[PDB]
């Protein structure tokens, strides 16, 4: 736990600073400087999945702050190279960087600089520097984790081929809460490949002001399988892990949770396309989304508060409906944490569904890009407990110990 | 020499990029939303005393980190408390803070966010809020840095009653290169006296676009007396020393040096009011000030480079033109400190000329406003070189060694 360089705190603190006067400026635009004529939807949907990855970041270095301060070893747990092994630091700089670059970008399309230069290239320009970053191989700006990081998502997308190791699927379940990242992607090579209207200056904000592109809705069903990749891949880990193990508990059980909201997506865009036609069954087939609905969110929750937190335990004794041990240094924390786990499961099941074509007027656009940091926060206090609890006692078999 | 803390950091870089990207906004606004038919040359008057103040702390943060990393014990040579010195990190981020607020009152006072509240009262609150930071009674924000400060400016400006130590000559000769920051002050009072009509939403960029106040002339005299100040502190602090040690070399020799800018400013209003009304005696009161300019500015230069810095030596041997022994790693940067010291010891005098309303074209104005940051950088250096200096050899006999 060697502290960062003090020139690390400083780039840290000169990026927030940055970030936090450019968000700033960009609210103050968007009150003032904005056109009404022009529908701005396609602009913050492409713009919410790098703000999203922006927040994940941002939150991923609290976390790293938490864990090496609480006391679990998360660079035993993830294998990481104990001398190697990134600060928080680091990771706070990295997504302050890649904010500034959001924010110039979203500034930048907000009103153009340059009149030559159309505005539906900033978001490629922002989103083709940050593939390039992480797909950058000179051995510049943080080569040895960007290369781990690039391994181990290549092990991950190649699920059935390698055993899973923690990292694995933790990386697999962040991507299973950070689906809309996937989702706003493939909206972006879709938006791209159709309706920007290249000689329009303007033509990723069109002037329509009704939606009703081809790739805003999603009845094509591609939106459905993009949206089930992050379970898919977890699903087929699991099996792996299974195979290798040849143990049911919990192995078909995580299974059969990662197969409810496949369901979830599949069934909702099914009857989502059912209602866009106006069929008799539109109503059975939503009371069968409302109840997969149920079901999915209340696996998912449970697992959550039982097996992957390990709280509830019945050795506890004095902690109430917690763990015998704890390494947090307030029980509050814990239980504010079970609390927000279970509103914002329901939030994350509300979502999946409502971006999957559920909800055609643009309030479904809005609460959808309210719940998604919704559902990376989750995310990032999931990881919290998650990580204490595997280095408190051993879940999911990973170590040997 | 202890490490600052690690959040001290972050907030120097939190205020570094907050100014950075408010100073980039700044230029901006000033490009695209600023109004030509009006004036702006009383706002660029009132805020460079702040810009000029801010710049200075920022140099002296950077003569703090050069005192500290090259070896000359500036702590010891202040008199400071050794274990409560102020590292550079600490003026990094009391410079970067107050640039924080000088560069919100500049961009509100561009576009005033609220119509009730006056443009005007924006360098008010800026100036009231740096002073009440000054004279802040409550212990929170470096009460034994800004109580030192208060006494220290206490004792300078109440010269002939208490001995003259190196910090208080320090600050003194800090304010003799600071001129312009009082007589900005000045200026402010005379300017909130007579020329705002505060019924006026504008008033503190008026209408005329044709200068003709009685402010923007000098007429009066009160902005010789305001530019003889600092020179006159330091003229009776040498005239103490003198009577406290009643040795002539150089004390009578720094009273001269001190001495010859009350006529130069002299000269140079006197003349400027004789050309104002026109008689025949300005070509022979010009040739007066010139050559007083030619004389001050050349006494000004040697002494800095012979007994300041302590260059020139005789007994220097290997070292071409320079002391004997050296503290800073490169010859070549005593070198350009000459060149540097030689070019704006010229320069310096000329930006005293030309506020005395000399050039009352708006060529004045500019080549002022350009120069004043220039000589702040001048003093930055002499800083360097004279504390230098001053751990080497005792020079001005204040240590008993
Ligand atoms: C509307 C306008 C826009 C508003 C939002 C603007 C968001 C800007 C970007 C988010 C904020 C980034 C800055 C905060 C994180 C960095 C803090 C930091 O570096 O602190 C230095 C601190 C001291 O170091 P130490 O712990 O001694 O040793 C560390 C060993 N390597 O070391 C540490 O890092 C440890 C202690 C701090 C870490 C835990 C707390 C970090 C986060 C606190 C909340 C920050 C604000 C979050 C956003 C709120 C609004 C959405
Ligand atoms: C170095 C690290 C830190 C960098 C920090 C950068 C901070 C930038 C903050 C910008 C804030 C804008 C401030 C605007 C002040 C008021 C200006 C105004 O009211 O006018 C807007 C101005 C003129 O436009 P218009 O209104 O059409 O003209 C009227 C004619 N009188 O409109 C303008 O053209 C003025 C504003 C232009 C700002 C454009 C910034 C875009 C980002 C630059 C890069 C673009 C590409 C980025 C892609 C990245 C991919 C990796
Ligand atoms: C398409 C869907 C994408 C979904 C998101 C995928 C990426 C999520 C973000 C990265 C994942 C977190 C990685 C692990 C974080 C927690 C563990 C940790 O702190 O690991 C430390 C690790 C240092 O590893 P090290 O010790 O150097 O390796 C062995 C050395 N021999 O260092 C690390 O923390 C490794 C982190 C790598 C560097 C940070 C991320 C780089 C920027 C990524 C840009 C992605 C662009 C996406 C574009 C599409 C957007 C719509
Ligand atoms: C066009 C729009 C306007 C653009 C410009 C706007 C204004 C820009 C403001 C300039 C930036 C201010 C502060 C920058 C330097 C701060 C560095 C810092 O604090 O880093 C910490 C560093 C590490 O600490 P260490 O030396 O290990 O130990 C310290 C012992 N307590 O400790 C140190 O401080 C030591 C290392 C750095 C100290 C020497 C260098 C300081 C100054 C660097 C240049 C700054 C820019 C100058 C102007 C550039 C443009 C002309
Ligand atoms: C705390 C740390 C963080 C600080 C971050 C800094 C925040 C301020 C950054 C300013 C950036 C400006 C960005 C401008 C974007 C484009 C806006 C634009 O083009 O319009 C200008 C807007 C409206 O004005 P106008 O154009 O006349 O209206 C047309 C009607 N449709 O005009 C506006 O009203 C928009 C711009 C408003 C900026 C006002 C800033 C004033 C500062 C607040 C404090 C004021 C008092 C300070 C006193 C200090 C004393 C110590
Ligand atoms: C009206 C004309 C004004 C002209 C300029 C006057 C101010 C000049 C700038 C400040 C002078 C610097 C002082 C010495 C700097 C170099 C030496 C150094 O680093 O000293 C460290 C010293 C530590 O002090 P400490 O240890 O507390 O003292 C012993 C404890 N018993 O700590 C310090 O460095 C002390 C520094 C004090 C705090 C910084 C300054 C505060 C802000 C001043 C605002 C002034 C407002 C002006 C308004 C008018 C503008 C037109
Ligand atoms: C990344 C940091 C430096 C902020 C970006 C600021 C720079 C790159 C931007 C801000 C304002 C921009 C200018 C705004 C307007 C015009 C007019 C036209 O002729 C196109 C170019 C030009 C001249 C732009 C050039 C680039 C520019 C100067
Ligand atoms: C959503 C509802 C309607 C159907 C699925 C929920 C039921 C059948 C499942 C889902 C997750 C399951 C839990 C998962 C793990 C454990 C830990 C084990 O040591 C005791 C049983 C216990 C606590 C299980 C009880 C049954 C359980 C709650
Ligand atoms: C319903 C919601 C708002 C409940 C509150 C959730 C949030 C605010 C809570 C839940 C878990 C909490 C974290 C639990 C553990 C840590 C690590 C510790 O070393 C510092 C505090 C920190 C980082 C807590 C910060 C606040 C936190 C993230
Ligand atoms: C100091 C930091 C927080 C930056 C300052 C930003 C805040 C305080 C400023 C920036 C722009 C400002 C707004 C600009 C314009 C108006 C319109 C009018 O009704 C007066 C108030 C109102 C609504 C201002 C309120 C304060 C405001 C929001
Ligand atoms: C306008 C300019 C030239 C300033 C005019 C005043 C100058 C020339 C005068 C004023 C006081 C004078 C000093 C007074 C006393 C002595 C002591 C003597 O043993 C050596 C010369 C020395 C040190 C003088 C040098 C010249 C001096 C500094
Ligand atoms: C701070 C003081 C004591 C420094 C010593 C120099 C004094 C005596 C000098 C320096 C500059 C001089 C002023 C320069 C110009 C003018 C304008 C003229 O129309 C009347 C005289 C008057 C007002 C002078 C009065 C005397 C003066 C103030
Ligand atoms: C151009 C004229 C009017 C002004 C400057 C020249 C004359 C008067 C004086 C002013 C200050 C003087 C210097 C003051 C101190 C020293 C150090 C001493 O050990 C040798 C002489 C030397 C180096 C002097 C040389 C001559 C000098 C530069
Ligand atoms: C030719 C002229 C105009 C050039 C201007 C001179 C400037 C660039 C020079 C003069 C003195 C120099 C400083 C002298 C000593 C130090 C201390 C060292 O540890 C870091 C560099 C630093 C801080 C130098 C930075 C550059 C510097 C400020
Ligand atoms: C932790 C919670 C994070 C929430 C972050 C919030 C981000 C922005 C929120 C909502 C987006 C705003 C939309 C308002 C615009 C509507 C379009 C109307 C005009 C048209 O239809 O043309
Ligand atoms: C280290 C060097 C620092 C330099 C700092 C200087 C920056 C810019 C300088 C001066 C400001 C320029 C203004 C141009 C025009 C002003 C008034 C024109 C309108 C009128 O006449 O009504
Ligand atoms: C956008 C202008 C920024 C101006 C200030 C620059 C701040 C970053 C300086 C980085 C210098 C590189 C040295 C890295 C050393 C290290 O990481 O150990
Ligand atoms: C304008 C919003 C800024 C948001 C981030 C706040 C940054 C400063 C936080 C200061 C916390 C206290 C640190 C104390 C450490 C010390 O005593 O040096």
Redesign the interface.
């Known amino acids: 736990a060697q502290?960062?360089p003090?020139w690390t705190?400083?780039?840290?603190?000169?990026?927030?600073?940055?970030?936090?006067?450019?968000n700033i400026?960009l609210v103050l635009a968007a009150v003032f400087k904005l056109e009404t004529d022009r529908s701005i939807w396609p602009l913050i949907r492409i713009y919410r999945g790098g703000f999203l990855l922006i927040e994940f970041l941002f939150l991923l270095g609290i976390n790293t702050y938490g864990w090496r301060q609480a006391g679990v070893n998360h660079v035993l747990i993830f294998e990481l190279n104990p001398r190697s092994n990134l600060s928080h630091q680091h990771l706070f700089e990295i997504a302050g960087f890649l904010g500034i670059l959001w924010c110039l970008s979203l500034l930048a399309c907000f009103f153009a600089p340059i009149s030559v230069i159309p505005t539906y290239v900033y978001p490629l320009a922002l989103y083709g520097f940050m593939v390039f970053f992480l797909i950058n191989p000179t051995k510049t700006f943080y080569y040895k984790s960007r290369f781990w990081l690039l391994k181990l998502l290549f092990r991950v997308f190649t699920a059935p081929f390698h055993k899973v190791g923690f990292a694995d699927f933790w990386l697999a379940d962040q991507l299973n809460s950070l689906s809309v990242i996937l989702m706003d992607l493939e909206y972006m090579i879709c938006f791209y490949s159709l309706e920007l209207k290249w000689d329009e200056s303007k033509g990723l904000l069109p002037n329509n002001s009704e939606e009703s592109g081809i790739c805003h809705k999603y009845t094509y069903g591609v939106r459905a399988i993009v949206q089930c990749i992050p379970a898919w891949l977890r699903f087929i880990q699991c099996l792996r892990r299974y195979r290798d193990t040849k143990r049911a508990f919990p192995h078909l059980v995580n299974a059969g949770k990662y197969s409810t909201t496949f369901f979830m997506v599949t069934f909702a865009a099914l009857y989502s396309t059912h209602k866009e036609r106006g069929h008799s069954d539109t109503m059975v087939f939503f009371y069968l989304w409302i109840v997969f609905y149920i079901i999915s969110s209340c696996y998912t929750l449970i697992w959550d508060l039982k097996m992957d937190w390990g709280l509830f335990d019945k050795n506890a004794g004095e902690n109430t409906f917690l763990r015998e041990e704890i390494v947090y240094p307030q029980k509050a924390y814990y239980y504010c944490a079970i609390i927000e786990d279970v509103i914002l499961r329901f939030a994350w099941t509300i979502q999946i569904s409502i971006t999957s074509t559920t909800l055609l007027p643009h309030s479904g656009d809005i609460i959808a890009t309210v719940f998604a940091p919704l559902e990376v926060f989750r995310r990032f206090v999931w990881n919290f407990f998650r990580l204490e609890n595997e280095h408190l006692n051993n879940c999911g078999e990973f170590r040997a110990v």
Request: aromatic residues 16%.
């Open positions: 502290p960062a003090a705190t400083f780039r840290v603190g000169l990026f927030c600073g940055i970030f936090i006067v450019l400026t």
